[PDB]
Amino acid sequence: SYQDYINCSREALLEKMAELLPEKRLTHCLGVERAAMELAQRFGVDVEKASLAGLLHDYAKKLSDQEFLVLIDRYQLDPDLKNWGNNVWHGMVGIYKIQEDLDLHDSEILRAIEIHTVGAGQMTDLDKVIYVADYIEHNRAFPGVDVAREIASLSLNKAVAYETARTVEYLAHQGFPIYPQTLETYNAFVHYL
Amino acid sequence: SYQDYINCSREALLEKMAELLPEKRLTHCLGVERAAMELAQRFGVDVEKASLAGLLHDYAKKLSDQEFLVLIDRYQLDPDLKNWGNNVWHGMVGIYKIQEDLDLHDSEILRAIEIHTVGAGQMTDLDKVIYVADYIEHNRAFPGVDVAREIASLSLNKAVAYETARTVEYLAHQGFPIYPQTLETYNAFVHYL
Numbered sequence: 001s002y003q004d005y006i007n008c009s010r011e012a013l014l015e016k017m018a019e020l021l022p023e024k025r026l027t028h029c030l031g032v033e034r035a036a037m038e039l040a041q042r043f044g045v046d047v048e049k050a051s052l053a054g055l056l057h058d059y060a061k062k063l064s065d066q067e068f069l070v071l072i073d074r075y076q077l078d079p080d081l082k083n084w085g086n087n088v089w090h091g092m093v094g095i096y097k098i099q100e101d102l103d104l105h106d107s108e109i110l111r112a113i114e115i116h117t118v119g120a121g122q123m124t125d126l127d128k129v130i131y132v133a134d135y136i137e138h139n140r141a142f143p144g145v146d147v148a149r150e151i152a153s154l155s156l157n158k159a160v161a162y163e164t165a166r167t168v169e170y171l172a173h174q175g176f177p178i179y180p181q182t183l184e185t186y187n188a189f190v191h192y193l
Numbered sequence: 194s195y196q197d198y199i200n201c202s203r204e205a206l207l208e209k210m211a212e213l214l215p216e217k218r219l220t221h222c223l224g225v226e227r228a229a230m231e232l233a234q235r236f237g238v239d240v241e242k243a244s245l246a247g248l249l250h251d252y253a254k255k256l257s258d259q260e261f262l263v264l265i266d267r268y269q270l271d272p273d274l275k276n277w278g279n280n281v282w283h284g285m286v287g288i289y290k291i292q293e294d295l296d297l298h299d300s301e302i303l304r305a306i307e308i309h310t311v312g313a314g315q316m317t318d319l320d321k322v323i324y325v326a327d328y329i330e331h332n333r334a335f336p337g338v339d340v341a342r343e344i345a346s347l348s349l350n351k352a353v354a355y356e357t358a359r360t361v362e363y364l365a366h367q368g369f370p371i372y373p374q375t376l377e378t379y380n381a382f383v384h385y386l
């Protein structure tokens with residue numbers, strides 16, 4: 001059960017999350033919980049760890065910049081992090097909020113949440129499940145999600161590569177800064193395409 | 194004159210280059226020579242250094258993989274370079290071939306040629322002139338070159354940003370590996386957009 005990992009039941013967690021998140025974001029997290037379960041089952045990842053990480057991945061999405069900065073100092077994280085924003089922080093720094101609020105200590109779950117946006121050059125299968133589940137969950141409707149979903153039914157590694165290439169392409173299209181760890185993921189996985 | 198920098202006259206250099214390069218590539222280098230002169234004049238960069246660097250930037254474009262690998266060992270360059278290819282090498286490693294062939298020692302010219310493909314987080318105005326001149330020279334006709342040319346008439350920094358964003362976007366679109374120094378350029382310049 002979820003109580004094996006955090007300090008409350010699934011039902012209690014959903015009540016807490018309904019306070020922290022706008023409706024659309026909670027629905028998203030519920031979608032990721034479901035997609036992560038399906039992917040985990042397909043690719044032989046612990047379905048419970050996948051479901052919980054999937055539900056939690058965007059828990060800290062609505063923390064203020066101030067709170068993230070406090071957490072960076074508190075946990076004496078990479079000071080370069082202060083150069084970034086919510087996009088980078090909600091996973092990379094938000095894991096400390098999750099740990100504080102829910103007493104989550106499992107290193108695999110924490111890591112999967114940590115790099116859910118940016119990935120890493122090296123990702124566990126659990127990491128990959130969350131990263132992909134986020135992108136393909138049933139509530140998303142971006143153009144091309146059908147292709148992501150087809151790829152994810154066949155290959156976890158290729159789904160990671162596809163998502164990362166699309167994100168890097170989109171950020172450059174938008175003229176948005178790209179976190180350097182994202183490029184590590186990109187170059188590590190792009191061959192799978 | 195060009196003999197102030199290399200071991201032969203412009204006319205002799207063009208004869209040497211006509212041997213090393215296919216016609217279309219030499220015409221390109223001639224275009225870059227001209228565009229670099231115009232940009233240098235506009236932005237107060239030494240027009241002669243700009244013209245020569247512009248003419249030379251793609252000198253080593255047709256060296257074999259073997260030759261580049263030899264040069265990497267010879268000059269004991271970053272061993273990670275062996276993971277890449279001609280795209281990275283012709284500037285980054287090709288500068289050593291240019292130095293060998295032409296006795297070029299000017300650090301500013303060498304550097305401008307060195308990073309003409311990938312840029313750097315920190316670029317001199319000369320570096321920037323070559324990087325942009327390459328993209329906007331009159332022979333190029335890619336969709337959107339008109340926008341690059343308008344930008345380059347107004348702002349060198351914004352032209353660098355525009356080109357870098359477009360290249361990162363294109364490489365990710367293509368599913369091609371992206372050299373990490375390119376991302377340094379991207380993140381350094383993207384604000385100018």
Ligand SMILES: Cc1cn([C@H]2C[C@H](O)[C@@H](COP(=O)(O)O)O2)c(=O)[nH]c1=O
Pocket residue numbers: 087088116117118134167171176177178179180182
């Ligand atoms: C990978 C990456 C994503 N993003 C953005 C794109 C998304 O709009 C936003 C939220 O990402 P997420 O939903 O995958 O957590 O973060 C960056 O700003 N920089 C990056 O390096």
Ligand SMILES: Cc1cn([C@H]2C[C@H](O)[C@@H](COP(=O)(O)O)O2)c(=O)[nH]c1=O
Pocket residue numbers: 280281309310311327360364369370371372373375
């Ligand atoms: C910036 C960059 C360009 N390229 C490619 C795009 C171009 O087709 C090719 C030649 O670039 P150049 O004409 O700007 O020297 O190199 C990469 O492969 N990786 C990179 O990181």
Ligand SMILES: [Fe+3]
Pocket residue numbers: 057058090091116117
């Ligand atoms: Fe997220």
Ligand SMILES: [Fe+3]
Pocket residue numbers: 028032057058134
């Ligand atoms: Fe999400």
Ligand SMILES: [Fe+3]
Pocket residue numbers: 250251283284309310
């Ligand atoms: Fe080149």
Ligand SMILES: [Fe+3]
Pocket residue numbers: 221225250251327
């Ligand atoms: Fe060129």
